[PDB]
Amino acid sequence: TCPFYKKIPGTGFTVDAFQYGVVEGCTAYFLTHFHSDHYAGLSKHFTFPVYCSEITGNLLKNKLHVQEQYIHPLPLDTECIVNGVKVVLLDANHCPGAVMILFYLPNGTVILHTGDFRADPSMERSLLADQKVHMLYLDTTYCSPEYTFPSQQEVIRFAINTAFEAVTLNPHALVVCGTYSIGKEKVFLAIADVLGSKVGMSQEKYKTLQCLNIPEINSLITTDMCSSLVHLLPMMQINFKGLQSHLKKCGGKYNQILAFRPTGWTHSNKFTRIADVIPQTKGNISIYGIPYSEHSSYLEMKRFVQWLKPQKIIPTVNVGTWKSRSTMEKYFREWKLEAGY
């Protein structure tokens, strides 16, 4: 049974609600992004209307085989009528194809559902500037002040400089980057660009990247592993045993691996600056954990909410424990008293 924080009151609509069977009264199912916890339940046998971005729609058709007649892509930044209700999709600054959804209810209430997002000051100049929001359904993944991490640009700067130094000292070093979902593609694209290489990967991953509308993608990626000195591997293989085993397969072309694991936040964020990050090393293998986040930091979250001034907040993440729920409610009230709404 579908929980309350996935229903949009006063509509036939749900958000990210595909794992509950047929939801009573739902006439349109929205999907914010192609991450498995959110699409859980969709398949080629789904027969209700799905509303989403163009990129999410490419992934539903090619990767999950949802039939074309049930896929309803909408353009971004554009007022659209769905089943008699005005909606807008906005870029969420999460993974490719990820949106926030603005719903203009028949009774005059305006609701924003962030999906998963990384808040940014640029959102203060979208179509959000123009009107008031009564209810905010908020991605609260990192809603606590201990959750700090650098900008995505500082993290990519660290990765490009690290990779370029290593491979210039040793032209026989291979770079490997872990992946387990869409998102964080700038990590491996930026490193391959500095090295003058395409990125090599499995057929299954190539297929996924081909759905993403990335400009000039055919110039950037390949399934010919032999031609490439940046390889992608599943995140599970990014350990000393998995990397040893990979280096065997490369036909004595390489004698060193430098590998990257993009994580979200880890507690080594509470002590170490990005500049000071060091790898784990065993022999000719080194592994860097780099804190490349596609969710808001606590400060970015608080800035966004203090600017939007919603009348009510419904968290969508960390909702399973009383301690989490109480912590999040306390910070919402601080924010409101500090800013005066």
* Positions that interact with Ni ion (CB under 5 A): 35, 116
Q: What is the smallest separation between the CB atom of 92 and Ni ion, expressed in angstroms?
A: 9
- Measured between alpha carbons, how far is 223 from 318 in angstroms, rounded to an integer? 38
Question: In terms of C-beta density within 10 A (0-12 exposed, 13-18 middle, 19 or more buried), how is residue 160 classed?
Answer: middle
Q: Which is nearer to Ni ion, 183 or 200 (CB)?
A: 183
Nearest to 59 by CA among 98, 4, 101, 1: 98
DSSP element (H, E) containing 58: helix 54-62
Q: What is the smallest separation between the CB atom of 184 and Ni ion, expressed in angstroms?
A: 11
Q: What is the smallest separation between the CB atom of 114 and Ni ion, expressed in angstroms?
A: 11
Q: Which is nearer to Ni ion, 34 or 260 (CB)?
A: 34
The three-class DSSP label of residue 41 is coil
Q: Which is nearer to Ni ion, 33 or 246 (CB)?
A: 33
- What single string gives the DSSP state of each residue in 121-136? GGGGGSTTTTS--SEE
Q: What is the smallest separation between the CB atom of 317 and Ni ion, expressed in angstroms?
A: 10
Nearest to 156 by CA among 187, 199, 121, 110: 187
Q: What is the smallest separation between the CB atom of 130 and Ni ion, expressed in angstroms?
A: 27
Q: What is the smallest separation between the CB atom of 208 and Ni ion, expressed in angstroms?
A: 15
Specify whether the CB–CB gap between 258 and 162 falls below 8 A.
yes
CB under 8 A, 24+ apart: contacts of 201-208: 201/225, 201/231, 201/232, 202/232, 205/179, 205/232, 207/62, 207/63, 208/59, 208/63, 208/182
Q: What is the smallest separation between the CB atom of 32 and Ni ion, expressed in angstroms?
A: 8
Q: Which is nearer to Ni ion, 116 or 185 (CB)?
A: 116
Q: What is the smallest separation between the CB atom of 283 and Ni ion, expressed in angstroms?
A: 35
Q: Which is nearer to Ni ion, 11 or 53 (CB)?
A: 53
Q: Which is nearer to Ni ion, 181 or 237 (CB)?
A: 181
Q: Which is nearer to Ni ion, 162 or 293 (CB)?
A: 293
User: Helix %, strand %, coil % for the chain, to 5?
Assistant: 35, 20, 45
Ordered strands of the 28-30 beta sheet: 7-8, 13-15, 28-30, 50-52, 71-73
Side-chain half-sphere exposure of 220, counting CA atoms within 13 A: 20
Q: Which is nearer to Ni ion, 192 or 301 (CB)?
A: 301
